[PDB]
Subunit: 331 residues, 4 copies
Amino acid sequence: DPAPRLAGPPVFGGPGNDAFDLAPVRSTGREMLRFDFPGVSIGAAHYEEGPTGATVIHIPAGARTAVDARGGAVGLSGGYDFNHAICLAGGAGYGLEAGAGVSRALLERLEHRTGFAELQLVSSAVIYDFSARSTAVYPDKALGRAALEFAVPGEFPQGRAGAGMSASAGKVDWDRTEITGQGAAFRRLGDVRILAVVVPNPVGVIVDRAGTVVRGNYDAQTGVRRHPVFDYQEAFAEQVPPTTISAIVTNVRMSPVELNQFAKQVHSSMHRGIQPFHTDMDGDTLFAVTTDEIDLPTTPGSSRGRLSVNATALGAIASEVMWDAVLEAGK
Amino acid sequence: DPAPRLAGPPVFGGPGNDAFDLAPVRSTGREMLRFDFPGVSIGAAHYEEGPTGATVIHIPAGARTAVDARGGAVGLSGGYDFNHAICLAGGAGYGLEAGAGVSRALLERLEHRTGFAELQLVSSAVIYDFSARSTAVYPDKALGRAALEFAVPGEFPQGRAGAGMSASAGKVDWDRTEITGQGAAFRRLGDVRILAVVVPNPVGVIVDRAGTVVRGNYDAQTGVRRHPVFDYQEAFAEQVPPTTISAIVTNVRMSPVELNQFAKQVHSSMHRGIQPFHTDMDGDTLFAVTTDEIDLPTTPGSSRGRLSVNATALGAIASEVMWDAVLEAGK
Amino acid sequence: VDPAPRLAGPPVFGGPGNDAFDLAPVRSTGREMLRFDFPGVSIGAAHYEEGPTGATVIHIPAGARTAVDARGGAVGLSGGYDFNHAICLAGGAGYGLEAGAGVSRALLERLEHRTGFAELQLVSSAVIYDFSARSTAVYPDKALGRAALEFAVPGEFPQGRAGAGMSASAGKVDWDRTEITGQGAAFRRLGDVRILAVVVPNPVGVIVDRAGTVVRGNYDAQTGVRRHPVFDYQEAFAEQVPPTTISAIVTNVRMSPVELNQFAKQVHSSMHRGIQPFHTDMDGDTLFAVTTDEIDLPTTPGSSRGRLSVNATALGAIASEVMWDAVLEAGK
Amino acid sequence: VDPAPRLAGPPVFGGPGNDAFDLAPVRSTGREMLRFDFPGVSIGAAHYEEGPTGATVIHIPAGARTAVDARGGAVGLSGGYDFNHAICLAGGAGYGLEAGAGVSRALLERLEHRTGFAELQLVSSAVIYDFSARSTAVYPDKALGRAALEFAVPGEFPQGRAGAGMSASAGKVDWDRTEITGQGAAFRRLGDVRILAVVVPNPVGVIVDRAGTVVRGNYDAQTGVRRHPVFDYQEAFAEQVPPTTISAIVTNVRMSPVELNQFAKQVHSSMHRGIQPFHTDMDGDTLFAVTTDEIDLPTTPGSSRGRLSVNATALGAIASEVMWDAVLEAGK
């Protein structure tokens, strides 16, 4: 069982962006994931003064996207069905401003052309990360611009980096909440590529494939993490009466209908590794993005089964890549 | 590991409803679950000639409902935000007819009154159960009427009963698909009551809390069940290039917004016990029903945490009741 | 001249249900038959006189891509599939969804009870609440849906009090001012582009013509005229707060699922021109947009009449006019 | 007399962006000021002359329950929250969502950078694409949103070319027939019931008056008149296929989340009376319905004008008229 990373008690009343001369820092995290996915770049920037940050997935050619905004408390901008970038950030709704920095930078690179087919489309989503620190600094336009400027192919900074600087899990009680991070994972199968990026700031906890609670809801009195349902059920017996933001990027061609159902499938699959999930208190948002490079076969058979090669199959594989990313964030 | 229940190869071309004098049978299943939930009755009927059936949850007072029709291939009638009954049936879209039998019977009990506030509201959902047998018999109006007539308080027939007669799991290849059943579970916590009813006919498999595949995708060549993702990933490496219908019934008062988010949360939670889930091939539909009898406290604290008594907490508990029901169906 | 009143009259209580009668389906002929040319689409309308109530079925045996826009607050819908062999529109409130089950079973029997995936017969159904306009509880049952399918023929539609429109009515600020409507259809061919609109207006609101005149619903027998409901509503607020329409649009033009869904929303909203108010909490307004996928639009949208003149939006605008014509036929 | 033309003119390429200019926000005054009495609601409108483009902000410091009806096919939306302290409407296509970020930051600073849940300042923003109506790439940026908030006052709205309406335009079958619109507002008080409509029509379609006359958009300089787009569309099909509006409705009447959501849909659909076509694939039509939760409706819906005359549907019908008035002010 990993050592605790308790976030500690809230400290509200701290300084905001106006109080500082804020210098973006290129986030490196605890280690770098390297992968091969041409046409996809990732940048991450933070302000130490928060600490808080933004992570940007840049696909300069633009890519078809489906959004599954399933949570009860979503903070989303754009949510477009085609994107040049996805911006994930802390700072609650204020952090949507980071995406404006990305949009503006992309407009400038386009030489301020504004034809419909030239509009640069950025979708952004946010986590509330203010309870995990004692400043009011947030990802502003300048920080989103920096994250884009820092974007490079084939690298992702794991852990406390970008949007994951002050992400945290397990919010039955803030005395038991632990810092998470951001995470990524990548698989290549034949010509198929799947990249998962996640910033888990859940009300729930991170759970591994054995069912062990590995991050969140850590009680310093016991030295042990608990699945929230044990707290909830005892709370009811006593008293009645007395957000995760994520992206899956693939190169497989999917129709709008397939892509949208793929998004829903992968997003629901994350209730395996984050529990509870999709709650009223969460603003869970998944972006499913395809670069539309590889055709699935017209018929779905293989030696492994009559119905084995299709978008559902891809969704099941992508679900595993995403669980791996969640576990990297919690590590 | 449980003994296999392989469904076997499709047999299309069999007789339909017209070929028989169809006698409804009161379904008893393998065993009866007994529970205490005043105002809620359950009836289950089948035709042996299918075998196929319908299961009806009757709440004569009517109850607030949210529907989460999350699957790609849903077969739903009504989907109302207030219901006197929920009808779950086999027979694919033809089995929606069983719900008409329930509606008509309720109209007759109301003495054919038709004022707005007197309309009897039945929501129905279906599974495709024709690949698991060799007739075209389906749950018709007469069978829905019978299921309602057989409804009694505080009993549920587990296993091959009602809508679960010919339910099956694990559909990467039909040579590895196994018969499931229907299942229920019940918990009472203080004054709070939660009943889960499920009819798993998934493309995916049933998974227990340890991560063991316990029903579906059984290979007679090996004697072992496999998680579908192992088949899918190898299929991709080789070739590129070379429904669950459910209800959660509770007595806790929830606003329409809370109830709807509760539905989404519990439904996503079922991706723990059914994998994959919410796929394009599935018509997954969950009804969340409240009899609106018990208030949650106005503030959410307990000795177990500051945020421990609320609708999210209820959703986490209900999720466990539903997983128990799924495992009963697969037993 | 203003249209003569067709007041529905007061609600009547205690009336019998289906099995009180030996119910024979009647092939509905309405006031007039619309004739049109659209191979692959058949319309059947059946009623029970004892209601009076009925069902109208659109049968497209090839199956057709469909978008559903269930925009009202009080929708009664079954199936709502993205691909359909038939659409069933019926009276009887939620009980009338049973008529669609009759259509489904009849189609299953035509397929010799085959049940493979590619042969599942898909029927979407929607209903109106028509019990305030008569004094029985008879509803469109499985037998009536079956009969409407059996009566379906290409190129004909019975206007007026026929099928699902038999007891449709409009203008429900007060039941003393509610008038019987009917069902309606209209058809246009532009080259080989074909657009068929079918509507069963049972609105809370009233039917309005292109000049803005209220022509069916909210007839005040004390004044002899119809005025817009908003006059009643605004007067009611000053006093007391002191200081369903089911429809289908069928076309032969290929539209992607995304285009077709937006087309549905556009055409459905356009009906707030002819029905006012519309899309209210009290309404179960449901439109089915169906394409038989026969004709492509040009790859680029230009013509002599503009750079953006030939596209799904353009088709939506044309279809919206066909639908308004259909609404006015229902109210006529 | 038919209105004089306000043709937008052809698209112009190569124009500069924000930092090419020393951009000073200007408080927009429009052609005329609407004055009204609705304490708790403030409106600010700011523009950059160098665009010309602008933003219009509705500030409700108590916070207000909101329903969003993002019905168009090409929506540009940020937040879309069910509870808002401000609504920001802006030009600049998706880039103009940045104006809302300026509003959010300004509100955060008024709260002394407090960040507890109950103090998060929630701003929903929507945009129009206004770059075809001018020859720069200037957009509403964070500074302009901040300025529009700072300029917000109760009881005033600048009609016409002001705020987000500075470069709004209508009628886009062909750009040679597109006309500048503006923004518009209307207000009614019925007792102590208050209804404010704000609209920024940038439609593909045209603005239509209550008589059915096209009054802004699709002006053909070769004929000197405006006709409905459907005439162009139908002619285009015969030839080539041979054989955004952003808006808010604010009221003080308490509505549950369910009523408020249906109210939004009803009022939004009603705008297809004044804007035609509407809700098209080409439009990003987004309506915000906001209630300040001050007045209850009576528990039962009766009055002298009918049994079902005082309810959220009634309120929706009245609000729909206020909105049509606002649309006509924008087109005037």
